[PDB]
């Protein structure tokens, strides 16, 4: 549904986060928090192998 | 498929491949690219 609209991955993450009752007005800047939290995790995940 | 034979392959009279519904998603995904709640909802309503 959102793919057709063109929601970027970090936005879809915000949507999942909104499901927690937490929005971008609750979160630290969400674009930076989400982008770096996930990218750092992915880095660590690859190195973990 | 009935006579499954080796990974990804199935025999009838020919060495056919095994299929799944993923093909229908690529269809729906690229068929309905528009996504406006008003315009597309109604444009699609006509299609539906």
CB within 8 Å: B34 and A5: no
CB within 8 Å: B29 and A5: no
Cβ of residue A20 closer than 8 Å to a chain B Cβ: no
> What is the number of residues in chain B?
48
List the beta bridge partners of residue B9: B17
Helix H, strand E, coil C: the string for chain A is CHHHHCCCHHHHHHHHHHCCCCCCCCCCCHHHHHHHHHHHHHHHHHHHC
Cβ atoms B9, B18 nearer than 8 A? yes
């Amino acid at each position: 549904w959102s793919a057709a609209a063109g929601v970027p991955f970090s936005l879809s993450v915000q949507y999942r986060i909104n499901g927690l009752g937490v929005t971008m007005n609750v979160l630290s800047e969400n674009q930076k928090m989400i982008a770096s939290a996930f990218n750092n995790a992915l880095g660590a995940i690859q190195d973990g192998f | 498929c009935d006579l499954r034979m080796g990974a990804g392959l199935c025999v009838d009279y020919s060495k056919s491949r095994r299929a799944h519904s993923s093909v229908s998603t690529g269809y729906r995904l690229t068929t309905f690219e528009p996504y406006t709640p008003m315009l597309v909802n109604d444009s699609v309503q006509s299609v539906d």
